[PDB]
């Protein structure tokens, strides 16, 4: 049990790793899974929310009481709202009016202000409104898709944690779904430095396989498939790309929940599906690691568990 801290953000990081024992064949490599949903805010985005805020503090760009704006309808909104409440910043999020009342109440419960943009404009209108508040009113925009603090925090916390957790062993393959790409790039840089023969595998939805030179599209793998190549993604870090479909990811999340007791989001089901295929390719004696970015409870209102 960790000794008491004075701020909830001091709990971010240090997430556990669980070996999969049922859904992976015995004739395959070991599959280990890092529970980023054990972060206090509920997802991997806890790390980059705190890092982007504390980097701007360090650089003198913001001070407690300042207002932060970010166009997000996913876990970065929850992570930023959580961190801003904990550190004393005013969080503002732009999002289409379409968003669910549950997610809106969650962000408002942290005291965040919501700027609701036209639902017909979707993410474009939300990004537009954030730019107006940034440019015309001086709101600080973390910009999770360009801010180097995103992949760098994975260089300085997530990656090193995996080194410390797999000391005495070698990691033969790391896989991660790509949303901002900060996870894959930051930990991939650190693991490749320590394990020069590791395979770094990008996971992306088969509906929007942009990284595989493919063509953008709509998917249900929340947290992935931004439709572009983010500045925070190091496109050289990965040696290969595994594409996962919506139904395959949902079926794997349900199996992991029923057979491993690990209830995680659809993107986690995609990561585990890819990690199992890679583990079957490597065979016994090899070690395959992937990341579970979010919990399944956050999606009990989705067809994933309906």
């Amino acid at each position: 049990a960790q000794k008491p801290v004075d701020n909830i953000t001091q709990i971010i990081g240090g997430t556990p790793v669980v070996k999969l024992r049922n859904v992976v064949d015995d004739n395959a490599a070991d599959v280990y899974v890092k529970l980023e949903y054990q972060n206090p805010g509920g997802s991997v985005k806890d790390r980059i929310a705190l890092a982007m805020i504390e980097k701007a503090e360090r650089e003198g760009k913001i001070k407690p009481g300042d207002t932060i704006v970010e166009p997000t309808s996913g876990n970065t909104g929850i992570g930023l709202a959580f961190v801003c409440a904990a550190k004393g910043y005013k969080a503002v999020f732009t999002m289409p009016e379409t968003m669910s009342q549950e997610r809106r109440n969650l962000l408002k419960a942290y005291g965040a202000e919501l700027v609701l943009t036209p639902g017909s404009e979707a993410m474009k209108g939300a990004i537009k409104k954030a730019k107006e508040l940034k440019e015309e009113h001086g709101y600080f925009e973390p910009q999770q898709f360009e801010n180097p603090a995103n992949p760098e925090v994975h260089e300085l916390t997530t990656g090193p944690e995996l080194l410390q957790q797999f000391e005495g062993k070698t990691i033969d393959a790391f896989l991660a779904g790509v949303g901002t790409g900060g996870t894959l790039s930051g930990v991939g840089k650190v693991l490749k430095k320590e394990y020069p023969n590791i395979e770094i595998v990008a996971i992306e939805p088969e509906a929007s396989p942009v990284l595989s030179g493919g063509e953008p599209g709509p998917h249900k793998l929340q947290g992935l498939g931004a439709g572009f190549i983010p500045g925070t993604l190091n496109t050289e870090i990965y040696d290969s790309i595994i594409k996962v479909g919506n139904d395959t990811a949902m079926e794997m999340s349900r199996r992991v929940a029923k057979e491993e007791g690990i209830l995680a989001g659809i993107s986690s089901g995609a990561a585990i599906y890819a990690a199992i295929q890679k583990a079957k390719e490597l065979g016994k004696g090899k070690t395959v690691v992937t990341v579970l970015p979010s919990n399944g409870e956050r999606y009990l209102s989705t067809p994933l568990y309906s």
């Binding site: 997000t72 309808s73 996913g74 876990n75 970065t76 289409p96 979707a122 993410m123 999770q144 898709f145 949303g179 901002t180 709509p218 929340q222 947290g223 992935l224 498939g225 931004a226 439709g227």
Partner: peptide, 4 residues
Amino acid sequence: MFYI
């Protein structure tokens, strides 16, 4: 539309 994405959720990140």
